Amino acid sequence: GSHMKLYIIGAGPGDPDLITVKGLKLLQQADVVLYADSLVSQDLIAKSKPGAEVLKTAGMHLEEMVGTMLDRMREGKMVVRVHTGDPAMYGAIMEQMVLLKREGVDIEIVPGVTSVFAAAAAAEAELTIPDLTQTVILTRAEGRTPVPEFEKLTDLAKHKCTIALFLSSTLTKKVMKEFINAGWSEDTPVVVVYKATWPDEKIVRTTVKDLDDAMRTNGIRKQAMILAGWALDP
Amino acid sequence: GSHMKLYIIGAGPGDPDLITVKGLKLLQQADVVLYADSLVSQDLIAKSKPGAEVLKTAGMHLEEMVGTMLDRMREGKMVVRVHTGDPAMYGAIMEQMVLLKREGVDIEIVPGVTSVFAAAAAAEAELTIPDLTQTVILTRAEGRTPVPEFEKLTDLAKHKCTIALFLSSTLTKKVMKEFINAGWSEDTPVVVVYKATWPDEKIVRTTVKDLDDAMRTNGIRKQAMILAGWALDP
Ligand SMILES: Nc1ncnc2c1ncn2[C@@H]1O[C@H](CSCC[C@H](N)C(=O)O)[C@@H](O)[C@H]1O
Ligand SMILES: Nc1ncnc2c1ncn2[C@@H]1O[C@H](CSCC[C@H](N)C(=O)O)[C@@H](O)[C@H]1O
């Protein structure tokens, strides 16, 4: 009963060809494709076969998402769900999973290249430098939505190791405040990547002091990955 | 002068098909392939064309590695260098880079799926759970080689968020000590993945108290990715 099956595909950072081999194969053969997220390309979007039912989720509600996927499955069809990057990182795949596995689905997750990785790449930075830092911290700035209590950016910034920030592009005023309160220099390097591996990509290199200016002058207000730390210097 | 060029390819966690699309294309057309690391499959190894000169590096010394690559380049040949996972994470690509760019090379890095990601996948864990934790910490246990001072595992374990440990498989006695000294419960979940996405893979799920036993009973002494934290529970 291999229709009863979810694949969760990691679609890569943006470029159509950072999709693993296997991710591309599935994507090709799926009958219903669910692209949650507007952070996939029109061009990933467009390799599924002709036929495919395509659906946007995100603005859909748990239980509806889930039942649509169960209906299609019952139907004998091949469903797949397409997350940007690697689903394990701020994917939200957990709750669907558990509903799903109750109705016996099998899951299969198909890892991805996360945009962390794509940003470092663009810049040509390893994130780990012997003697310098051996830790990379991947988190998000608190905005409205507060973060758990022992995870604040100030306190995660006191190990001084490379910090890589998802969903924070328009919180660079907090970002600098917490870095300075954990006592980073105002000179430590920042690099921002804007749509990495998109044909619109922008690479901004800058520093804690200028962050917010850099952002707002480059007009990067979304999709940007911010690496901050002395491994991004030279 | 597009022979003067390094691609740094991320080869994925193990399976031949977690290699991005583009990584596979390069790998196909390269004249000299440099696989540093014995952590690639015999089967990635084996898609390069017939012809290819294949070289193992690692036990080679900086400047030799570099000059061999420059000689081949001069020669008009297509070189590529194949790191496991994503090179940005404990890649060591930095020093080659800089020598290289001096002799004017261009680099191109081709991101990857890092084994972080592959482990979470196998287990079916998102690493980020709203209300639970929003931070994933990627580091390594200190062995002989000490880690920088503000990065110790105890102190990185006091945010209580998912911690993912590369190269520490045979340091699970320190691992439990530092987790317990940062006051984790002895019950918080551990999952180890052993050769993830290899055909030998092993998934061990266990807890801080049993870690070291789990390891030594499963006999996992190498290639293992250890995720530790309440998102790996259920
Ligand atoms: N191509 C891209 N360029 C840079 N960052 C992007 C990006 N796509 C993903 N992001 C980041 O990811 C956030 C979406 S959260 C989804 C992230 C994802 N699962 C991944 O693994 O990459 C955005 O705020 C930005 O922080
Ligand atoms: N398939 C695999 N299974 C689990 N972990 C592995 C692995 N391959 C990489 N590792 C980990 O990576 C360490 C090598 S350091 C190289 C890691 C790499 N650049 C990556 O991105 O995945 C090993 O100690 C183990 O900690």
Curated annotation (Swiss-Prot), chains A, B:
Query: What pathway or pathways are given for this protein in its record?
Result: Cofactor biosynthesis; adenosylcobalamin biosynthesis; cob(II)yrinate a,c-diamide from sirohydrochlorin (anaerobic route): step 4/10
Asked if the Swiss-Prot or TrEMBL record annotates the protein with the keyword Methyltransferase, the reply is: yes
Q: Mind listing the GO biological process terms from this record?
A: cobalamin biosynthetic process; methylation
What EC number is given for this enzyme? 2.1.1.271
**Family note:** Belongs to the precorrin methyltransferase family.
SUPFAM superfamilies noted in UniProt: Tetrapyrrole methylase
Against InterPro entries, the record matches this protein to: 4pyrrol_Mease (IPR000878), 4pyrrol_Methylase_sf (IPR035996), 4pyrrole_Mease_sub1 (IPR014777), 4pyrrole_Mease_sub2 (IPR014776), Cbl_synth_CobM/CibF (IPR006362), Siro_Cobalamin_biosynth (IPR050161), Uropor_MeTrfase_CS (IPR003043)
User: What does it catalyze?
Assistant: Co-precorrin-4 + S-adenosyl-L-methionine = Co-precorrin-5A + S-adenosyl-L-homocysteine + H(+)
List GO molecular-function terms, semicolon-separated.
Answer: precorrin-4 C11-methyltransferase activity
EC main class here is transferase
Could you tell me which species this protein originates from?
Priestia megaterium (Bacillus megaterium)
Q: Which UniProt keywords apply?
A: Cobalamin biosynthesis, Methyltransferase, S-adenosyl-L-methionine, Transferase
NCBIfam families reported in the protein's UniProt record: cobM_cbiF
> What interactions and quaternary structure are annotated?
Homodimer.
Concerning Pfam families, the annotation shows: TP_methylase
PANTHER family from the UniProt entry: COBALT-PRECORRIN-4 C(11)-METHYLTRANSFERASE, SIROHEME SYNTHASE-RELATED
**Name of this protein:** Cobalt-precorrin-4 C(11)-methyltransferase
